[PDB]
A paper describes a structure:
[name] receptors (P2XRs) are trimeric, nonselective cation channels activated by adenosine triphosphate (ATP) that act as molecular sensors for extracellular ATP (eATP) (1–8). [name] activation triggers signaling cascades that result in up-regulation of the NLRP3 (NOD-, LRR-, and pyrin domain–containing protein 3) inflammasome and activation of apoptotic pathways.
The adamantane-containing ligand [name] is also coordinated by hydrophobic interactions and two hydrogen bonds with D92 and Y298, but not with K297. This, together with the increased hydrophobicity of [name], could possibly explain its modest inhibitory potency (IC50 = 330 ± 100 nM). K110 forms cation-pi interactions with A839977 and [name] and hydrogen bonds with GSK1482160 (distance of 2.9 Å). While A438079, [name], and GSK1482160 demonstrated progressively less recovery after longer IC100 exposure times, none of these antagonists completely prevented channel recovery.
Author numbering:
A (entry chain C), B (entry chain B), C (entry chain A): 6 to 74, 81 to 440, 473 to 595
The structure:
Amino acid sequence: SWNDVFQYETNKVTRIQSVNYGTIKWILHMTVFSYVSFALMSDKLYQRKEPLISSVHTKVKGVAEVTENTKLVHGIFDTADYTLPLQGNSFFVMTNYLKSEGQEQKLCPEYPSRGKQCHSDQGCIKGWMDPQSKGIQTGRCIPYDQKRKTCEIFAWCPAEEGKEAPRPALLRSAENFTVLIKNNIDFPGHNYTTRNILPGMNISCTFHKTWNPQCPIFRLGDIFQEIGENFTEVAVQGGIMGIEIYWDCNLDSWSHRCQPKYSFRRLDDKYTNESLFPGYNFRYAKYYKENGMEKRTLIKAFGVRFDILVFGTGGKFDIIQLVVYIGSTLSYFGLATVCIDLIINTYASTCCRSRVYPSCKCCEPCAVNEYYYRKKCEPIVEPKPTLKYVSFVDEPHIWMVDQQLLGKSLQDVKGQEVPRPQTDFLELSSPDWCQCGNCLPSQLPENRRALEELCCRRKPGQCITTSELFSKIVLSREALQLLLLYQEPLLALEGEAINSKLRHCAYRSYATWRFVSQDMADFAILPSCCRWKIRKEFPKTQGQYSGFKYPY
Amino acid sequence: SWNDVFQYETNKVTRIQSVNYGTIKWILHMTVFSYVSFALMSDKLYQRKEPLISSVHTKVKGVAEVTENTKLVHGIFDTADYTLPLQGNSFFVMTNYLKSEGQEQKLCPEYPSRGKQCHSDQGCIKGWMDPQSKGIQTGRCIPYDQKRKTCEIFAWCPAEEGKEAPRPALLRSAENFTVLIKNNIDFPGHNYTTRNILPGMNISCTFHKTWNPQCPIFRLGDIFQEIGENFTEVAVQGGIMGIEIYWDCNLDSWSHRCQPKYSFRRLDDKYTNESLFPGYNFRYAKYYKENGMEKRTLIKAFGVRFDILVFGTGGKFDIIQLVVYIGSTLSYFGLATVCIDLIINTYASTCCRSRVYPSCKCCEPCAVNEYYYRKKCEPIVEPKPTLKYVSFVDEPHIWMVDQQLLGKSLQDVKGQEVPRPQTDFLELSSPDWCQCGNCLPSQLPENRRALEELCCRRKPGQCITTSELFSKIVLSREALQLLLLYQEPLLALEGEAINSKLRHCAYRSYATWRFVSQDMADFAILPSCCRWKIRKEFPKTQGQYSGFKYPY
Amino acid sequence: SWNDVFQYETNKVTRIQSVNYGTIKWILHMTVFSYVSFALMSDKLYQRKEPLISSVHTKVKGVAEVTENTKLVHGIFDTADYTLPLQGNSFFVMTNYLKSEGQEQKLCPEYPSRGKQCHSDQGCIKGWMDPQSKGIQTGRCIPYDQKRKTCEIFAWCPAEEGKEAPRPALLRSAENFTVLIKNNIDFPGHNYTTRNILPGMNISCTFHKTWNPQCPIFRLGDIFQEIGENFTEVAVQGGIMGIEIYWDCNLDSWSHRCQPKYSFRRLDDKYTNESLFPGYNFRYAKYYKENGMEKRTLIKAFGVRFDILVFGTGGKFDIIQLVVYIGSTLSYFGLATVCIDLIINTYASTCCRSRVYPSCKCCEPCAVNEYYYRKKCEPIVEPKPTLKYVSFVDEPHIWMVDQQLLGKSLQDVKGQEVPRPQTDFLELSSPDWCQCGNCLPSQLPENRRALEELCCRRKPGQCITTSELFSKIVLSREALQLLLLYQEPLLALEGEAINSKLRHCAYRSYATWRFVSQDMADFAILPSCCRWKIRKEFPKTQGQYSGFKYPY
Ligand SMILES: O=C(NC[C@]12C[C@H]3C[C@H](C[C@H](C3)C1)C2)c1cc(CCCNCCCO)ccc1Cl
Ligand SMILES: O=C(NC[C@]12C[C@H]3C[C@H](C[C@H](C3)C1)C2)c1cc(CCCNCCCO)ccc1Cl
Ligand SMILES: O=C(NC[C@]12C[C@H]3C[C@H](C[C@H](C3)C1)C2)c1cc(CCCNCCCO)ccc1Cl
Ligand SMILES: Nc1nc2c(ncn2[C@@H]2O[C@H](COP(=O)(O)OP(=O)(O)O)[C@@H](O)[C@H]2O)c(=O)[nH]1
Ligand SMILES: Nc1nc2c(ncn2[C@@H]2O[C@H](COP(=O)(O)OP(=O)(O)O)[C@@H](O)[C@H]2O)c(=O)[nH]1
Ligand SMILES: Nc1nc2c(ncn2[C@@H]2O[C@H](COP(=O)(O)OP(=O)(O)O)[C@@H](O)[C@H]2O)c(=O)[nH]1
Ligand SMILES: *[C@@H]1O[C@H](CO)[C@@H](O)[C@H](O)[C@H]1NC(C)=O
Ligand SMILES: *[C@@H]1O[C@H](CO)[C@@H](O)[C@H](O)[C@H]1NC(C)=O
Ligand SMILES: *[C@@H]1O[C@H](CO)[C@@H](O)[C@H](O)[C@H]1NC(C)=O
Ligand SMILES: *[C@@H]1O[C@H](CO)[C@@H](O)[C@H](O)[C@H]1NC(C)=O
Ligand SMILES: *[C@@H]1O[C@H](CO)[C@@H](O)[C@H](O)[C@H]1NC(C)=O
Ligand SMILES: *[C@@H]1O[C@H](CO)[C@@H](O)[C@H](O)[C@H]1NC(C)=O
Ligand code: NA
Ligand SMILES: [Zn+2]
Ligand SMILES: [Zn+2]
Ligand SMILES: [Zn+2]
Ligand SMILES: [Zn+2]
Ligand SMILES: [Zn+2]
Ligand SMILES: [Zn+2]
């Protein structure tokens, strides 16, 4: 069994000598290679990509000059007056505010905010919580002022919820503020970290798309401007602005590039419905005691929340990724073989020589694919008991009958016409169904008698036995003896077994002569006339003829 | 060399005419195709998937009515009384609180919190920082009240750290609060952004799993209820609740679907040990001066922190992804070939005809694979100097001896039995080791003499030379001359070279006759008797016979 | 057409009996298999990996003892004195502070902070906003003290911006604080969640790289120490420290492992330039009224912001991933075939036997690849009208002339030398260009006359017709009749058609004899002498000879 281990199977091939097929093969190979290489390089499919982990540190710079009040009061706003302590992925800049000082929890009328006017106590409902006015109604309409009445609520009073944001915005000068963004990113899998500020950077720069795309200092008004947003208008009600930091990082030494790209995107919907809280604000309370009572000052702060959005991937060469990609693409190099073999198979068909070619003489030189197909494919049939081959001296072709004989003579049964082989010129150099007058009834049992009910021809005429070739090949005892001696050099030409050997050799000689291929000759069926002439020449002294036996 | 460029290699094939193998091939092809198509569609392997970047904007609505104190004091809590300014990925709702007003940094007893009772100054340690009481011990036990003593600490006093959260929770009515979540998501690579609130949405809706799965307004109690959590109990100590927003987005126009799925998950461990800070709270200080001293009010706020967890991917058709997947799956279409070829190889074995088939007559019709194997595979051997073939007229097979002759006669040396070919019926139509009496001693040097020590047979009997076929094929000068003239039409039948040519042709004729295949005949070894009869017929006038020469 | 459906194509193969090629094949197969298995297991390419979603909950423990002031004042700092309410992905610990109490918006000199000294009103600019001093200049230099002058600004006064952070840091004892980190992670696609604190964990542990790698309680000084950072120095100006939590989670039951790895990384640049805001601090304002004026206390808080960075992936077995990987790797098992076939093709070349082999006798036994190549590849040519084969009795080879005859005799036209086949030994057993004296002028039209202008030889000598083999094969009427009867058993040997059949058979017999292969014989060109001898033997009674016709 060891020898069976040390075996190598190699495919048999036909190397074709063709300009067209060679050119097609090479063009297709180069097309596949070019595309797979382009996909490998463009999409970096030799790299393992890793998402980043980010830390953000923001610092807002700027002082706003304002004129509040009546009287003209001049003041300033510094960072502690308009920012929250948070300095990470989001920072808030106050641009507008409403202040309610000295609030007490008691009864008061609700602010008449765009539809809260009340005409009678019927409209007001006692005990009903209003999340807008932020109080509990008493069910009594009372006069907010000398012109309009509003429902009475138990709330922090005076109640100013629903009052409109000041216009113009009090801290609209925040458009001139600047924010410095410090961004640390890391790729833990690749063990790589970098930051967005490197040594040698200009400290007096301000970000610009073209002139200063790497300056991490942003004027807020410029942020709004770059994407066609108006800071002055957004300042009244506030909003949410996205600062996007994209890191497309190549960590291969020969192609190292890890730099941030800055972009801006408004994140709050401009057309948010009035009942859905348009803009951005929060309510901040400062609590104190005065006049022996628990009081509160309410700040409604409007402004812009800036969300720092940091995203990206880090690419480094990985062997496994490259191997997987190459393997995924290897099968595409069979395209040339598939296409050319399809061409060979299609143009070998007969439908072309008879139908396509007369209509179009351009694709007639492609008749050479018949030769290629003959050289490439060997058609064979499954050897089954019903397989039979018959040849008629009248016809030039062979008939295949792969069906049972249900008592019908094989002469009448129809089959599939198949062609005769090339013959290897180098080697060479009164039953009713009968139409020859020499056939005899079959001596087999009636169950399998139809197999032998066969004549040399389908139409009346001379029997094939009359030809001298028949006697030379089939009936010549010298020729059969020579063949047997070639197979068995020391065979004994005596006994009743020699007659059986000669009869079998004569059968095989007729079958090879009239069918050429051993594949057909093995399942060929001899005509009755030839069969009985052979048997007469080499008769069985005692016993019954078995006839055709299934080889498998 | 140009012609060598324009070549195409096509595989030689045998097309089998079988119902079973065709059916198996097509079934396997369809199975592979169906599975690869299902994998392509189910997992969207034609798409490039991109993670989203999210912005969240939350707004809590609700007013709580409370009854604090003794006396019955009625009050309300609005958003500024129970929320932090932050309104992004997390928002906090206060549900309970402990307040410590007018704290002074001085000495005081520590709160007796579940095991802090002290019986003597021995238990207390001076200068030891207690992170629980949040003070520095003095080492002196002092009376906290008229029943129990506790260690004295320098701390913000009065010290209430360790005091239990109020039960029931003061702002347990926050279960009736609602939060509106506005969620902006973007897929920068696909240049796609959308939000979770679209025009035409109902503003008076509240979220429900079935009735209103797309309403972004959530009642907090409902959040807890949907996942079997009790808001009233969690309100006492607080906790962390996750609101999950899943975006499974298909960005192909023909299959566009980008909508959020909302789910809830408690994020704080219910069974957190008492020493590990169970629930959620933080300590918030308000600082002031009174009575000429620096005082502080401490708020211990208990409540629920809601974490908004937004995740998902965006899929869009990508050509490279599709090409890579198809290539990764192409090789699976060789399964039919692998399986059917394995069947052919296995059932061609002899082990079946002798062992399996008698035991089971069901798998006997599969003997047709011997014919398929003969038509498919041509076995050949490596041509090496030791390769030799010998045939004995007694035996019906051929012997291969691929081993050196270490002085042992080739007759005695054993080899591997190999079969004789079909013979192409179409073309056809007193040394001790000697057992024939006609062999002679070898004239070669003793080093390589054993090669020629070969007889026509392994047992005593008539020599093969006695057959008339031997004289007709090997010794017939006319036949050899005819073969030579076929090879050389104008050959000259004179000189001593013609005898050498005739001798070589006779050797080749014997070798082809007794071995058929040129592969075996090329390495066949002639018996001594036949060799010397040939040499006698065509003897060398002057010189020494070289004998068998290695062709390669 | 149904039978055409039930077909199976199997490749014809040559199984080689070689130790070297079998060993090479198996070694290469095992190498490919080992590598693909290693890649599958190491990189878990049978798993679908999913990123985690995280929630973080932090709690800082610790009380700092301090000595502030002059007078010696003793105090403590508890969590509310040094932390913000936020307890999620980032927490802040105050380590140093500057306090500015009782600020009023008025005019004051700016703090002389490292280059703000002013020598005259020329340096100062009126109306110019200074983001550093956080005030608006008046353009007048005024004395900050009795030694140095500074620009006058309208700002919150007294103005202390630019004052250096205290050294040593007031809350440098925060190095002894501890933080407990609770981390909840989930893999929504795999429906898996876990936390970093499991039942049975030691509550009195502190994190250590080796002794306690799973304790989620971290001493801040230890965090700084593990990565060679000095907390005491960073405390003066502050900084940003990263706590990294890596989750490499295997969610397969047989290989379940989902545990966090803790690592630390400083996130703020140590060498940040003085103008870029080195360290970490924020300005926090407390507003009040006193003496009938609006006053503010400004806290500049320095400290360490700790960023909790949670990242990782969850792996679970997925069938589609495994199928895609196996398919991507299947083609690599053709490596053995590619390599061995390349060896066969290369060593079959002639360049070796003549050039490489004499130089190196080591690679001479590899001459056996000529036999393998002959057994593997059948070279054929494209059948085109210009294809012609000629043989000269003088030469031992065949000539191929695949070119047009532009009036030049085929004898003179040069072609490509091609070898003669093996001949199937088993089957066997006065024109100027003329050099034989028997050729005659061609009777074809002058357009195509050059094709027939061919002689049996390229040099003067005896004509091939003189050989007896020529008469036996080509001119023997009996032999041609026998061949025809073999093809047509009942052919009629009468009429003028029999002469045409005999002439064609004689042409084919000469072509097969002198070219062996039917491929060459089909496009072979007969010499004029042989052609006209054949025509004389079997002449056309009436008509003109057509000569060679293109078969395709
Ligand atoms: O509290 C204030 N800012 C803090 C803060 C800002 C932003 C984040 C956060 C929450 C909330 C919103 C409140 C902190 C504030 C201060 C001033 C003082 C300067 C103008 N007055 C100067 C006298 C004129 O001479 C005016 C108005 C406000 Cl609303
Ligand atoms: O400070 C309070 N909330 C702010 C805040 C809430 C939450 C986030 C953040 C931090 C911290 C925790 C403190 C801000 C507060 C207010 C009240 C006032 C209403 C009840 N008293 C009304 C009189 C009755 O007539 C009562 C108790 C508290 Cl704890
Ligand atoms: O306000 C303070 N901390 C709160 C806070 C801390 C950090 C986060 C955030 C923002 C900002 C920065 C302010 C909250 C504070 C408190 C003390 C009191 C204890 C020492 N004095 C005790 C008397 C001695 O007997 C001293 C100094 C300060 Cl700056
Ligand atoms: N191919 C073929 N073989 C035949 C035919 N008739 C008989 N044989 C073969 O001849 C053998 C039977 O010999 P037969 O002359 O019929 O009688 P028997 O040999 O005395 O039993 C079987 O092995 C058959 O394979 C025929 O028509 N065609
Ligand atoms: N296959 C085979 N070839 C043989 C044998 N003996 C001789 N030859 C061939 O015959 C040639 C040697 O001729 P030989 O009659 O021995 O003597 P020589 O030709 O006068 O030197 C060699 O080229 C061999 O290939 C044999 O036993 N088997
Ligand atoms: N291969 C080959 N075939 C030839 C040659 N000359 C004639 N033929 C064949 O012979 C046939 C023409 O017959 P020919 O004797 O020339 O005259 P015809 O048959 O009376 O028209 C054609 O079908 C050719 O294929 C030749 O030189 N080489
Ligand atoms: C921003 O600064 C420029 C500087 O000249 C000034 O003209 C402009 O008014 C400023 N914007 C606001 C809103 O004050
Ligand atoms: C921006 O909005 C303001 C309203 O506050 C308006 O006066 C101004 O004209 C707007 N700017 C542009 C460029 O539309
Ligand atoms: C929530 O509102 C319902 C409305 O009827 C009320 O019955 C219930 O008591 C409220 N829950 C709390 C905790 O107050
Ligand atoms: C929820 O917890 C509270 C305790 O505050 C309890 O009274 C109530 O029965 C609980 N609800 C359920 C449904 O268990
Ligand atoms: C930290 O605690 C140790 C405990 O002995 C003490 O020696 C050390 O001084 C403390 N560090 C600071 C900065 O106070
Ligand atoms: C850390 O920095 C402080 C400065 O505050 C210094 O005194 C101390 O020596 C430093 N420690 C080390 C180990 O360098
Ligand atoms: Na493949
Ligand atoms: Zn008949
Ligand atoms: Zn007949
Ligand atoms: Zn002998
Ligand atoms: Zn013998
Ligand atoms: Zn001539
Ligand atoms: Zn001639």
